[PDB]
Design a protein around this ligand. Structure first.
Ligand code: GTP
Ligand code: DZ4
Ligand code: DZ4
Ligand code: CO
Ligand code: CO
Ligand code: CO
Ligand code: CO
Length: 219
DNA sequence: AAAAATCAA
């Protein structure tokens, strides 16, 4: 059924480090020293565990990348927090417009607490430094807003024998708040049929993205 | 049976 296809599809899209992943608890994350499995993903989808994925494979390539638009911590508790909610969507729309201009297919996710991820998926892994560079240059094009932080995963160009950074992946439960992390549309409205959205997500071409790095870098 | 908690920039 569609939900079973979603299990296999999730594993292909959020494919990072081969042999380590992460789970969220209340106050941190913890590495799990083995490959992610189907049972891990069923536990993600049901709320029994919350998965985070290390983006960098052992050869310092990534199969996906993400912007992380956040409300700054000290803006969170304000009574006019709705302003910085708007601002976070303003910054996300600007980034997305640039990404569309570069024909980079991407998807929005409400992260279950204080912001949004913009997910970028690749059919074949690409060098972590190349996508990171593209994402940094695109950020350098847009106006920012007060109280918003934009973060770029991958955070590393290379592991140097380490794990790198991980990102909490969608369709799970945010352990800081108990709310589902869900895909949203271009207007930030929650998609009703998440499973089907997941099964329609498209991968960018590594060949195109590789060409785009040389192009932006202008050699 | 449940409490405890990693790893990075
Ligand atoms: N790897 C790792 N990254 C972190 C950790 N804490 C924060 N970050 C990252 O740093 C960014 C800034 O978040 P902050 O809210 O300022 O994090 P903090 O200063 O440690 O305080 P809290 O997250 O509220 O506990 C986050 O979006 C995360 O990407 C951590 O303990 N380990
Ligand atoms: N203590 C920690 N240890 C290891 N990795 C962590 C971490 N904290 C975060 N990360 C990783 C996983 C995280 O996904 C990412 C930074 O995300 P955040 O901005 O802190 N939280 P998110 O974007 O997921 O949702 P929202 O912002 O609404 O709270 O770095
Ligand atoms: N004076 C005003 N006039 C019209 N709409 C207003 C408004 N004040 C607030 N709105 C609201 C009601 C409108 O339905 C909503 C639309 O604003 P976006 O969705 O941010 N931008 P757009 O839809 O034009 O396209 P894209 O997202 O691709 O950029 O703003
Ligand atoms: Co911290
Ligand atoms: Co962040
Ligand atoms: Co965030
Ligand atoms: Co709109």
């Amino acid at each position: 059924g569609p939900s079973q296809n979603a299990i296999k599809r999730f594993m292909t899209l959020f494919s990072g480090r081969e042999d380590v992943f992460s789970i969220q608890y209340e106050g941190g994350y913890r590495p799990i020293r083995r490959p992610l499995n189907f049972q891990d993903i069923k536990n993600h989808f049901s709320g029994k565990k919350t998965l985070g994925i290390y983006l960098l494979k052992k050869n310092d390539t990534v199969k996906f990348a993400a912007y992380d638009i956040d409300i700054k911590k000290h803006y969170l508790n304000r009574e006019d927090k709705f302003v910085y909610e708007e601002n976070s969507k303003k910054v996300a729309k600007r980034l997305s417009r640039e990404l569309n201009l570069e024909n980079i297919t991407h998807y929005f996710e409400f992260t279950g607490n204080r912001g949004y991820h913009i997910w970028i998926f690749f059919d074949i892994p690409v060098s972590a430094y190349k996508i990171k560079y593209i994402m940094e240059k695109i950020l350098d094009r847009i106006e920012l807003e007060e109280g918003i932080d934009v973060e770029i995963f991958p955070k590393q160009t290379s592991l140097n024998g380490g794990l790198g950074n991980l990102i909490k992946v969608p369709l799970g439960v945010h352990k800081k708040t108990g709310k589902k992390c869900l895909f949203v549309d271009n207007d930030f409205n929650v998609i009703e049929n998440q499973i089907e959205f997941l099964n329609n997500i498209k991968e960018n071409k590594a060949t195109e993205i590789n060409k785009l790095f040389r192009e932006i870098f202008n050699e």
